[PDB]
Amino acid sequence: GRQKARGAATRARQKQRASLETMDKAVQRFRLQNPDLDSEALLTLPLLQLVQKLQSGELSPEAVFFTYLGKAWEVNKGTNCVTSYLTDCETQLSQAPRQGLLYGVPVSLKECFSYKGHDSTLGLSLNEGMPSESDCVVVQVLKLQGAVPFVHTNVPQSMFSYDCSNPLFGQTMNPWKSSKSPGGSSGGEGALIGSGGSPLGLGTDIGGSIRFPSAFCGICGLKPTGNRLSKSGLKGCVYGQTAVQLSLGPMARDVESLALCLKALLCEHLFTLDPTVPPLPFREEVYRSSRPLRVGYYETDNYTMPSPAMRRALIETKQRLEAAGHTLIPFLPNNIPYALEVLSTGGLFSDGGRSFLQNFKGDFVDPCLGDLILILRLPSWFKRLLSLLLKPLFPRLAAFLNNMRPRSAEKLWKLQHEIEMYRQSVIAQWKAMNLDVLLTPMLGPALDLNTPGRATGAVSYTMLYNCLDFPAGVVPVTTVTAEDDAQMELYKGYFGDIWDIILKKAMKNSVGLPVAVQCVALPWQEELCLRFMREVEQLMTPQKQ
Ligand SMILES: *C(=O)NC1CCCCC1
Ligand SMILES: [Cl-]
């Protein structure tokens, strides 16, 4: 019963196509009137220098806007990362506030950041032809700070994924290798920023969806504490689920860009437009501190075996931090399996997936979601039974199935308390070793297209910090060598289940692809997190600063 959804696809693709044409026509007009502009030099300027030149008058907003608009159009050709051109953004451009900290900066938005007059489909038929009545709060703040949001970027269908394909706009590709995923669900942002088509973007993250795309596409990303920024006006699939919180945050080519973005967002405009966000301004002096850090670290979470490239990235960064004078302390959060199998899965699937499934009624199911929908559709008893059969041979799979069952409000309260007491556990663990920050591996290199949805285990590295609601960011530190990739033939994985087997195959043939580490601080500590990220960036890739 899918013809209605075929109509949605046809209409969505027409709007995407017309958006692209509108963009190109404006780019072609602009270039004719400005034939001598050094567009390469403008595009490769770091955000901090770009901002300064816009503030001084050295570069016109128009010059910067249309150049990035040109570049976004071009990189889209090989990645399919842009779903929509934000129609009024040229008239926004001419009205941008001069004193704004982001005056004249083109910014790209993940499709779920509602923008007036435009759909936030999430790749779902039922959200097509349902344009937002207004800009969401962070989009309002961006504009009040002088920025110019200019495109919506692609997401995997429903966002419940770390790949990036849906049936309306299709499949987004990694800009480093087109057989590879850009990661997700902020994958359009990853591909666009990662190929130079936007200097700053916003994404969201409930199990790693800022961090996967950033890592897979070789850019920086930060997932703040859930309630550091406003979620007001965000489009979603499931509403009212508060056990594992959603976070939104910046993506960019460097760390300084992330810190600029958070500084611009954490202002009175935000705090008055959404009073439910604690009014905590950006603390520059914590961000800029150069005091030695106590850095906890691990090479593996003992759940998802790291690739050789991940492991090399982690050890090398550790050794450089030591040489720079920081104290590196072996540290692994306790009971990760519990945090993932019981707390995180149970938090996301407390209703057995029912609320989530209503979004898919009458719709196609994108191949990049794997068997997720099929598995969620199954009866609560046949899940339970299959869980008991799989437990001897495949304990991970069994635990997954058993913890995605529907349960009562009573049981949800108990789960919510366990999440709270686990949070306090890890905090106490952290304080007993007197850590400032924590260094971890990050999933990478980029997986093959249509494999993330079959490698669910691999979310272990990022999902843990959604469960704990700790700020976490990722920084590119190296690229896959011939040796790293060859050494994947010796990868086994701790479990030997289908998730380990898919991941092994998924990560092969990745020579030249970027690989990241993850940086973590305690709740409300975004500034310390970024300081630390800045340090990693400086030591492993000094040409960024
Ligand atoms: C981004 O946060 N992606 C997550 C992948 C695991 C399931 C929830 C969504
Ligand atoms: Cl039909």
Ligand SMILES: [Cl-]
């Ligand atoms: Cl709060």
